[PDB]
Design a protein around this ligand. Structure first.
Ligand code: BCL
Ligand code: BCL
Ligand code: BCL
Ligand SMILES: CC[C@H]1c2cc3[nH]c4c(c3C)C(=O)[C@H](C(=O)OC)c4c3nc(cc4[nH]c(cc(n2)[C@@H]1C)c(C(C)=O)c4C)[C@@H](C)[C@@H]3CCC(=O)OC/C=C(/C)CCC[C@H](C)CCC[C@H](C)CCCC(C)C
Ligand SMILES: COC1=C(OC)C(=O)C(C/C=C(\C)CC/C=C(\C)CC/C=C(/C)CC/C=C(/C)CC/C=C(/C)CC/C=C(\C)CC/C=C(\C)CCC=C(C)C)=C(C)C1=O
Ligand SMILES: CCCCCC/C=C\CCCCCCCCCC(=O)O[C@H](COC(=O)CCCCCCCCCCCCCCC)COP(=O)(O)OC[C@@H](O)CO
Ligand SMILES: COC(C)(C)C/C=C/C(C)=C/C=C/C(C=O)=C/C=C/C(C)=C/C=C/C=C(C)/C=C/C=C(C)/C=C/C1=C(C)C[C@@H](O)CC1(C)C
Ligand SMILES: COC(C)(C)C/C=C/C(C)=C/C=C/C(C=O)=C/C=C/C(C)=C/C=C/C=C(C)/C=C/C=C(C)/C=C/C1=C(C)C[C@@H](O)CC1(C)C
Ligand SMILES: COC(C)(C)C/C=C/C(C)=C/C=C/C(C=O)=C/C=C/C(C)=C/C=C/C=C(C)/C=C/C=C(C)/C=C/C1=C(C)C[C@@H](O)CC1(C)C
Ligand SMILES: COC(C)(C)C/C=C/C(C)=C/C=C/C(C=O)=C/C=C/C(C)=C/C=C/C=C(C)/C=C/C=C(C)/C=C/C1=C(C)C[C@@H](O)CC1(C)C
Ligand SMILES: COC(C)(C)CCC/C(C)=C/C=C/C(C)=C/C=C/C(C)=C/C=C\C=C(C)\C=C\C=C(C)\C=C\C=C(/C)CCCC(C)(C)OC
Ligand SMILES: CCCCCCCCCCCCCCCCCC
Ligand SMILES: CCCCCCCCCCCCCCCCCC
Ligand SMILES: [Fe+3]
Lengths: 40, 265, 20, 44, 273, 320, 44, 44, 44, 44, 44, 44, 44, 44, 44, 44
């Protein structure tokens, strides 16, 4: 935002949500790799 | 399919349209000859006779009881222009003797327009300061422009914006009033004003930017702002005064600095 | 325009391409 | 690292990022649907 | 200084190249340096058109056709009687059109105007360059260009269009046609509105722009305004030209085959099939 | 740095303007008004109000009827399937009656009766829209230039849909109601009658369409370049010549040696636009009724090229 | 109830009603002419 | 997490989300209908 | 649950909801009529 | 409940309702006429 | 004869004369190049 | 007669005349070049 | 003669002359490339 | 009754009525001419 | 060298750099998909 | 002689010269590539 504290809180929320998103995508990609690998 | 000999219906229609189109071209030329004609000699100013295919003069019934126009009766410009030919030939350009912006030569030239303001359909002055308009306001999400700094062609800050003039008929900004450092208030056409800090792409761009919000006028320099033609009556601008101001600003793209009149090379 | 001649291009199209 | 938010507005950045992510995800899913190998709907 | 108001506007300056060397008029025509280049290139192109015609089967102006070299000749400079005349005339036309754009820019500068007209004409110049320079270069042969003949370039258009099945199925062609039709409708509307405003009926006075706004709001419920109509007309015409150039440039280089088969993509969208 | 008069930088908003009063007996405008900010970037942001008299009501009702007929025939052609509707929309068509019916007004509904009904209602709607533009011009004391420009397009439309099929006694010559189908009709029309390039009136209509594109490009560019001097305020420049009109005339006089006036340019534009459809309708009307092979007709008039004039085999081979 | 005329102008209502009736009647007569059973002009 | 509702307007986010979700559900149901495996209406 | 009204326009919400309901209902009816299994008009 | 007329103008509502009902009735009659089972004009 | 310079300025006259001379010379040289008899480049 | 110069400017008359003479001479030379009877470049 | 510089400026004339020389040289070189006798690139 | 003239201008109503009558009469005459049974111009 | 940030605004610089990187990466991935050697979706 | 730089701006002259040199170099390289004798990429 404007002050460092608001920016740090926004970064904390963004990083947490991004980590959750990446974890879900990683689980999905791992399941797909177990099902049908795309690197023979 | 033939009418007689090798003549047919399609050929007859084509020839009829060809003749009609020749007649239409002649008529369009006649209509195009209503302003600025007859022609005159480049040096002596001797007026040419006139077309054999010309008809009657055109009369425009003006609104607001202003009478008739008759564009064929518009007074011809004075043959003596404030300039001297670069070389003695019919095609040579004129070099202005003094200040082209003050004298009205080339891009700074103006026409002798009517000395009364344009009016709305009900008779009110068309171009007025936004306070005198009928409940006309700037768009809330658009720049307010009031108090913004004004940049000149030489990158100097000539002054600030003190008023906004709008067209009461077309609902458009026509002039910005600029108060200079000396305190003089001058009118500047909105068509020579670049508004900065209000880019659509920048708004789309997900950035936090403190871009300077100002108005740039690159037509004329900061000093030249002190010679903008003035208004005879406050809050009212005539067609002649509009032409004067617009010509003064438009001629700056050639005459504000000497380099603007020089080739790139 | 290329650095070849029209005759050379035509000969190449005929012999090297359309004839073999 | 947090200072990134002193330059980019969070609301507009999130909106643009989510629009781009939606476009990319739909593109990838349709590309996978196109292929015979990764089509998950036509056959059993 | 022919027109009654012309003399004060005929000043020096505003040239991009040449300065005072060619800064003068010849009758109504301003020359400048790019006027000299335009004159030379255009006169040479016309003279070479007629020189190649005199070598051809006929001098009938309908049937005169200056043809490009054969496709087998590739992108080489051909002999003059075998397509070289067409190549020289193409170069002359390119130079003449570019010089026309630059002369328009110089004249705009002399009158204190912006460069709208040179850019608008440069769109059409780009369309021509795409037709007879860029597309043959991409396709690999000058024989892909259209001939310099009043009725033979229509034959070129017909045969190129039918080489793709039905050229109506080119979507960029559809877009350009839509822009052309909308432009002609808009031009009809704008000319009619201006003329009806300045030529009233029933003995009434000349109208104000409020009357034009009122007429088009009573007609279709919306009025674009005096500035908006010119902006929209310029947009429509320039888009028509640009998308014509794009539609021709992609056919034979990026897309090869029948344009009708292209629309088989629509039937394969998994939403409805 | 330099404003180019392409987009409005700052917009002016206010109460909606309901229009000048009518000089005739009009019912009263329907005061449904709106404001679009993005339209104000190019032109005027105000939407509405609207006028809905007798002519507007008739036009809207009959055009709605015709469009409903065409759309319901499309839905029936799709087997009432929305997915088939979407998949085949470009290929859906309401086709005219076959040649066995001649120009009979009595065709079974699924064999061309719906086509005739839709044509009738569309023609009624178009004619009432023309009458509405005439009455709207009359109510404000304005000229009839727009009604005549619209009449030219209506002339082409009626020649395509009714007049030419009537003269040939064949409903099958009419244009089908469909996206790809009417393009196919255009191509087939060119194919059966030789080559429509060699129709001199088709060439004239192309000349005028091209010239209208040229004229709008030049005129819009000139007006926008003259925005520094109030060029777009053309009514006042026509009735009181300013420096914008003088500069606009002098630009084209210095470019091509001749020029128009601020009024004459709009006459040029109006005539080019009108002549496009006028020549188009004339050329279509004489095709089949008067001339059946336009290439043969061109051969008789010494403007049909042969292979010894130009051989297009190379151009075809390049495009494969 | 007559109060319907407190919200709708009778002139506009009559014009719209008669336009709709005209479209309906023309449609029905055209449909009847389209059928051999009801066509009253083709044969005796 | 709840602070999100300080940077995005709920009155517009809800509308956009609901419209997009409805379009997505329509698209998915149509895609399923276009396949013979998942068409639940054409056969008993 | 009632807190969705002091800020959401009941007029616009109802209009959009009914438009969506009509579109969905017409789409579903048209699909059933296109199927041989569920068509209720062609056969007794 | 009558309070619906506090939020909806009945002139616009009635005009829209009568237009929509006319379109719907025309569509249903057209569909019925398009079927051989319910066509009432082709045969006796 | 010298009095021709009383009516035509030397600058424009020279420019036009040299433009015309260039056009004519290029035209004649190209015409000669196009003929087999006067082509000085193709054969020895 | 010399009095023709009281009505026609010599500068405009001479320029118009020479442009016309040029166009006519080029037309005649081009026409002669087309015919094999008068072509002077194709054969010896 | 030197007096030619009293009517034409050296700075602009040099630019125009060099542009013309460039175009002429390119034309001559391309014409030479089109002939088998003088083409120096296609063959050894 | 006569009170119908309190709501409709006689001039506009008369012009509209006569235009409509002309269109209807022309349509009916054209339809009759298009039938073999009622055509009165082609056979004796 | 940090001094470059004096001459360039890193906000717009980052936006343009990310747009260019996205275009380049999508182009490379599409080109790799075009080739049969590096296509990773069609076959196993 | 540095007199030239008194009459020609060094920046404009350098820009024009480098543009011309770039176009000439690209033209020559493309012409060399077009010929089989000098093409340095197609063959070993
Ligand atoms: C073989 C496949 C199965 C099937 C497999 C599934 C699966 C798997 C799912 C569904 C789900 C749904 N199915 Mg199902 N479904 C089948 C067949 C049908 C048929 C039918 C014609 O037979 C209908 C009407 C439905 C309807 C539905 C919805 C009730 C629901 C998705 C809507 C939703 O909540 O998201 C839309 C989201 C919103 C927020 C709606 C937005 C609110 C709007 C703006 C207000 C309403 C207005 C208007 C009605 C909007 C509709 C317009 C159009 C949709 C554009 N299904 C067949 C039998 N179905 C989903 C579910 O359970 O959701 C909870 C789900 O996961
Ligand atoms: C294979 C294709 C053929 C060809 C076959 C035809 C045929 C057939 C025709 C043309 C016609 C034309 N052709 Mg062609 N044409 C060819 C190639 C070309 C090429 C080219 C290659 O560059 C060009 C530039 C053209 C250009 C043109 C136009 C000049 C002209 C139509 C312009 C017009 O007025 O808009 C179209 C404007 C209208 C149709 C007027 C419409 C006005 C009405 C009132 C609008 C009603 C709309 C309604 C209310 C909306 C709701 C409707 C409902 C949804 C149903 N053709 C080749 C040779 N062409 C037409 C013509 O007139 O030329 C003689 C024509 O009939
Ligand atoms: C079989 C035909 C014979 C032949 C038979 C004759 C006969 C018979 C006559 C001539 C005449 C002329 N012939 Mg010869 N002539 C032949 C072949 C040639 C060839 C050549 C192929 O190289 C040339 C250059 C000429 C040249 C000429 C001219 C010197 C002369 C025309 C004078 C004139 O007023 O020009 C007109 C040009 C101008 C007035 C303008 C000045 C030209 C300058 C250079 C500008 C050029 C303009 C530029 C190229 C394009 C601008 C066009 C418009 C102005 C827009 N002939 C062949 C061999 N010729 C005529 C003559 O003697 O008249 C006195 C004449 O009666
Ligand atoms: C928006 C794109 C559209 C457009 C724009 C438009 N046209 C324009 C302009 C604009 C804005 C100008 O400012 C410019 C102008 O100044 O008009 C008065 C012009 C113009 N549009 C012109 C023509 C034109 N425009 C065309 C198209 C279009 N113009 C578009 C559809 C067409 C088509 C469709 O073919 C025609 C024929 C000219 C009237 C003029 C350009 C004047 C010019 O180029 O001056 C050079 C001087 C000459 C004497 C011409 C060169 C002579 C050649 C060297 C010889 C002939 C070579 C040619 C290739 C022969 C082939 C002909 C065969 C195909 C028959
Ligand atoms: C509202 O403002 C406007 C106007 O007026 C105010 C307009 O006039 C206009 C212009 C529009 C019109 C007048 C309507 C008519 C125009 C139409 C139909 C479109 C254009 C089509 C045409 C066929 C017109 C003619 C076009 C041409 C290119 C003709 C050009 C002819 C010539 C001879 C050009 C010669 C000039 C040169 C080569 C450059 C200078 C060089 C020399 C003089 C050579 C010198 C050397 C020697 C040897 C003589 C517009 C657009 C406008 O918006
Ligand atoms: C813009 C494009 C510029 C291209 C270069 C160019 O346009 O070259 C110019 C003309 O080329 C021409 O038209 C002829 C070009 C022929 C190309 C083939 C060269 O003119 P100048 O040397 O000034 O004067 C020539 C002298 O005879 C004085 O009249
Ligand atoms: C080709 O590939 C195909 C086949 C298409 C497959 C690909 C598909 C893809 C890529 C799809 C991706 C989808 C996706 C990727 O995120 C979807 C996400 C969906 C989400 C996040 C849905 C969320 C819904 C939330 C809802 C409905 C919340 C509603 C809340 C409400 C209305 C609350 C109201 C309230 C309540 C109760 C109390 C009151 O007092 C006050 C108030 C507070 C107002
Ligand atoms: C698919 O399509 C087909 C195949 C056709 C099948 C389907 C067909 C369908 C669905 C059709 C549906 C039709 C329909 C569905 O409601 C029709 C309704 C018709 C109605 C309501 C008609 C009503 C008419 C009323 C009339 C004419 C009244 C006139 C009154 C007048 C002129 C009064 C004037 C007055 C008088 C004297 C005195 C003054 O003091 C006051 C004043 C008042 C001025
Ligand atoms: C279908 O088409 C074809 C097949 C061709 C068949 C048909 C052909 C047809 C229909 C043709 C019809 C032609 C026609 C139908 O009238 C012709 C008429 C021609 C006429 C009237 C020509 C007249 C010429 C007069 C001339 C040249 C006069 C010149 C005078 C001059 C220059 C005087 C100058 C002067 C002088 C010295 C001194 C000054 O003090 C005063 C001043 C005065 C300045
Ligand atoms: C050719 O093509 C084929 C054949 C497909 C091949 C090629 C494919 C290619 C090139 C693909 C490239 C892809 C790419 C390249 O970067 C993707 C990047 C994705 C990224 C960075 C995703 C990031 C996601 C982050 C998310 C979802 C964050 C959400 C945060 C939220 C919502 C926080 C809210 C908040 C909270 C909770 C509390 C408040 O107090 C403060 C506040 C902050 C408000
Ligand atoms: C969503 O679903 C619904 C149903 C609600 C809406 C569906 C809307 C849709 C999908 C509509 C789609 C329409 C489309 C795609 C139409 C396309 C039409 C095109 C491209 C037409 C092109 C040309 C048409 C022409 C030129 C037609 C001209 C017809 C004329 C002039 C006919 C005249 C007929 C007359 C005068 C009737 C004579 C009657 C007679 C002879 C009996 O008496 C005099
Ligand atoms: C507006 C320029 C002057 C027009 C004068 C026309 C007559 C003289 C033309 C001179 C042309 C150049 C010299 C002759 C070649
Ligand atoms: C001064 C600039 C002249 C050229 C402007 C651009 C022309 C059109 C390019 C597409
Ligand atoms: Fe205009």
């Amino acid at each position: 935002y404007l002050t460092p504290e608001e920016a740090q809180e926004i970064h904390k929320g963004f990083m947490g949500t991004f980590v959750l998103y990446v974890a879900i995508a990683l689980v999905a990609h791992a399941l797909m790799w177990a099902y049908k690998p795309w690197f023979g | 399919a033939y009418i007689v000999g090798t003549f047919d219906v399609a050929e007859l229609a084509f020839l009829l349209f060809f003749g009609f189109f020749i007649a239409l071209v002649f008529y369009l030329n006649r209509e195009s000859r209503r302003e600025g004609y007859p022609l005159e000699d480049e040096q002596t100013g001797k007026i040419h006779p006139g077309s054999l295919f010309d008809g009657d003069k055109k009369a425009f019934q003006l609104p607001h009881g202003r009478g008739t126009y008759v564009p064929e009766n518009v007074a011809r410009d004075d043959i003596n222009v404030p300039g001297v030919r670069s070389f003695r030939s019919a095609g040579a350009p004129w070099v202005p003797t003094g200040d082209p912006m003050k004298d009205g030569m080339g891009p700074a030239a103006w026409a002798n327009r009517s000395k009364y303001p344009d009016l709305t359909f009900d008779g009110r002055p068309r171009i007025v300061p936004i306070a005198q308009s009928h409940e006309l306001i700037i768009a809330p999400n658009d720049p307010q422009l009031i108090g913004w700094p004004v940049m000149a062609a030489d990158k100097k800050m000539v002054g600030k914006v003190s008023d906004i003039w709008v067209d009461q008929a077309e609902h458009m900004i026509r002039y910005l009033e600029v108060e200079t450092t000396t305190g003089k208030k001058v009118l500047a056409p909105m068509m020579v004003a670049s508004v900065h800090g209000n880019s659509l792409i920048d708004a789309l761009l997900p950035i936090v930017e403190d871009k300077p919000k100002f108005v740039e006028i690159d037509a004329i320099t900061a000093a030249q702002f002190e010679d903008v033609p003035a208004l005879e009556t406050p809050g009212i601008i005539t067609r002649y005064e509009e032409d004067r101001v617009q010509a003064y600003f438009g001629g700056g793209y050639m005459y504000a600095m000497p380099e603007r009149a020089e080739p790139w090379l | 325009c290329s650095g070849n001649t029209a005759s050379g291009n035509i000969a190449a199209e005929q012999a090297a391409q359309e004839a073999a | 690292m947090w200072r990134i938010w002193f330059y980019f507005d969070i609301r507009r950045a999130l909106v643009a990022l989510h629009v781009g992510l939606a476009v990319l995800a739909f593109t990838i899913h349709f590309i996978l649907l196109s292929t015979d190998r990764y089509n998950w709907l036509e056959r059993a | 200084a022919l027109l009654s108001f012309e003399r004060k506007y005929r000043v020096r300056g505003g040239t991009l190249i040449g300065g005072d060397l060619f800064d003068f008029w010849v009758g109504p025509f301003y020359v400048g340096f790019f006027g000299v280049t335009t004159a030379i290139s255009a006169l040479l192109g016309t003279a070479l058109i007629f020189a190649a015609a005199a070598q051809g089967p006929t001098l009938n102006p309908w049937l005169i056709s200056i043809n490009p070299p054969s496709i087998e000749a590739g992108l080489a400079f051909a002999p003059l009687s075998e397509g070289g005349y067409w190549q020289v005339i193409t170069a002359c036309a390119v130079v003449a059109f570019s010089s026309w754009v630059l002369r328009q820019a110089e004249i705009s500068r002399k009158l204190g105007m912006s460069y709208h007209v040179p850019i608008a004409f440069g769109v059409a110049v780009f369309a021509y360059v795409t037709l007879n320079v860029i597309r043959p270069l991409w396709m690999g042969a000058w024989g892909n260009g259209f001939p310099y003949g009043i009725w033979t370039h229509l034959d070129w258009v017909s045969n190129v269009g039918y080489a793709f099945g039905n050229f109506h199925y080119n979507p960029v062609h559809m877009l350009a046609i839509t822009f052309f039709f909308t432009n002609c409708l808009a031009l009809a509307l704008h000319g009619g509105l201006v003329l009806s405003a300045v030529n009233p009926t029933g003995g009434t006075d000349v109208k104000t722009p409020e009357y034009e706004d009122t007429y088009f709001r009573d007609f279709i419920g919306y009025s674009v305004g005096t500035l908006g109509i010119h902006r929209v007309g310029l947009f429509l015409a320039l888009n028509a030209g640009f998308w014509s150039a794009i539609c021709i440039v992609i056919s034979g280089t990026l897309y090869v085959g029948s344009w009708i088969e292209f629309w088989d993509f629509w039937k394969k969208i998994p939403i409805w099939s | 740095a330099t404003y180019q008069n392409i987009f409005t930088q700052v917009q002016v908003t206010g109460p909606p303007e309901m229009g000048v009063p009518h000089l005739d007996g009009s019912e009263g405008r329907v005061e449904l008004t709106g404001h679009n900010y993005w339209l104000g970037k190019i032109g005027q942001a105000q939407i509405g109000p609207i006028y809905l008299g007798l002519l507007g009501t008739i036009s809207l009702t009959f055009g709605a009827a015709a469009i409903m007929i065409i759309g319901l025939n499309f839905w029936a052609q799709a087997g009432w399937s929305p997915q088939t509707f979407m998949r085949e929309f470009f290929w859906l068509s309401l086709d005219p009656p076959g040649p066995e019916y001649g120009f009979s007004p009595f065709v079974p509904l699924n064999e061309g009766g719906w086509f005739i009904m839709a044509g009738a209602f569309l023609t009624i709607a178009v004619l009432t829209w023309w009458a509405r533009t005439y009455t709207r011009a009359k109510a404000l004391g304005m000229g009839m230039h727009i009604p005549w420009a619209f009449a030219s397009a209506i002339w082409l439309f009626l020649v395509l849909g009714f007049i030419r099929p009537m003269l040939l006694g064949d409903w099958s010559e009419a244009v089908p109601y469909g996206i790809f189908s009417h393009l196919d009709w255009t191509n087939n029309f060119s194919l059966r009658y030789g080559n429509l390039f060699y129709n001199p009136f088709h060439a004239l209509s192309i000349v005028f369409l091209y010239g209208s594109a040229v004229l709008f490009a030049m005129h819009g560019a000139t007006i926008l370049a003259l925005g520094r001097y109030g060029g777009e305020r053309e009514i006042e420049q026509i009735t009181d010549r300013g420096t914008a009109a003088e500069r606009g005339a002098l630009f084209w006089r210095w470019v091509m040696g001749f020029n128009a006036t601020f009024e004459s340019i709009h006459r040029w534009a109006w005539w080019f636009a009108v002549l496009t459809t006028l020549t188009g309708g004339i050329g279509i009307l004489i095709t089949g009724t008067v001339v059946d092979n336009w290439y043969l007709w061109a051969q008789e008039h010494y403007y049909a090229p042969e292979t010894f004039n130009y051989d297009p085999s190379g151009a075809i081979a390049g495009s494969t």
